[PDB]
Design a protein around this ligand. Structure first.
Ligand SMILES: [Zn+2]
Length: 257
């Protein structure tokens, strides 16, 4: 099945998922000089005060911190969005080395990792129905660089020992995702896709300009996770990122300056 290895990585995905070569695939390189300021864009509204995390899961390609999305609690709205999008999970993509890991790039610069907070459009009722719509998802992307530790991340880092391998999950309540946000909500936005199979073209991407800093020790623990299941040969969960895809007929808009 698909993955990030030599024989099943991103260059192979199109064989099972032909939309891989589609017209609005993600991630993309963000050329900061060609992104146009759009003064009609609104400030992003990130309302996570009532967010209720439930669980953390190693799904064999990343770890997802999952939220109770059965009510309107943690919601993203405003910015480029029409309507209300509910937080369902977040996860990260990271590298084997600090010089790579992000999916989006900024003037070809790769960050050490990238956080994706995934939200679905409430007008479609559930996530499964939402991914079938061109405006079904809003994903907030945040870049990570290695430097000072992110205090708000440590609770995630410390539970990873209990979900080392594919298919393991652990209770993970009362995690506050506001602790993962940078100071500024300045962003770029463009229409795109899921960056993992099925690669559905259902995402409004909102990528924050300001990265957060995590420590070397923090990202080191991510690199000890496994793609494989328990009792299988060990493959470290690293370089779980899709590279930049062709922009094609799309414009990236900036919320700022
Ligand atoms: Zn992702």
């Amino acid at each position: 099945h698909w993955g990030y290895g030599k024989h099943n990585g991103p260059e192979h995905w199109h064989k099972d998922f032909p939309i891989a070569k589609g017209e609005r695939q993600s991630p993309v390189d963000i050329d900061t000089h060609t992104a146009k300021y759009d003064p009609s864009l609104k400030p992003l509204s990130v309302s996570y005060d009532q967010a209720t995390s439930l669980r953390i899961l190693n799904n064999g390609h990343a770890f997802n911190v999952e939220f109770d999305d059965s009510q309107d609690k943690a919601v993203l709205k405003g910015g480029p969005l029409d309507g209300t999008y509910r937080l369902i999970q977040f996860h990260f993509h990271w590298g084997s080395l600090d010089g790579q890991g992000s999916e989006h790039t900024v003037d070809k610069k790769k960050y050490a990792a990238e956080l994706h907070l995934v939200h679905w459009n409430t007008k479609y009722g559930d996530f499964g129905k939402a991914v079938q719509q061109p405006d079904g998802l809003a994903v907030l992307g945040i870049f990570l660089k290695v430097g000072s530790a992110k205090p708000g991340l440590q609770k995630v880092v410390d539970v990873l020992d209990s979900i080392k391998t594919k298919g393991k999950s652990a209770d993970f309540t009362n995690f506050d995702p506001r602790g993962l946000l940078p100071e500024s909500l300045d962003y770029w936005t463009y229409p795109g896709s899921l960056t993992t199979p099925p690669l559905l073209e259902c995402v409004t991407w909102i990528v924050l300009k300001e990265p957060i800093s995590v420590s070397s020790e923090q990202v080191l623990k991510w690199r000890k996770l496994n793609f494989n299941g328990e009792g299988e040969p060990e493959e470290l969960m690293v370089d779980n990122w899709r590279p930049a895809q062709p922009l094609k007929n799309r414009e990236i808009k900036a919320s700022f300056k």
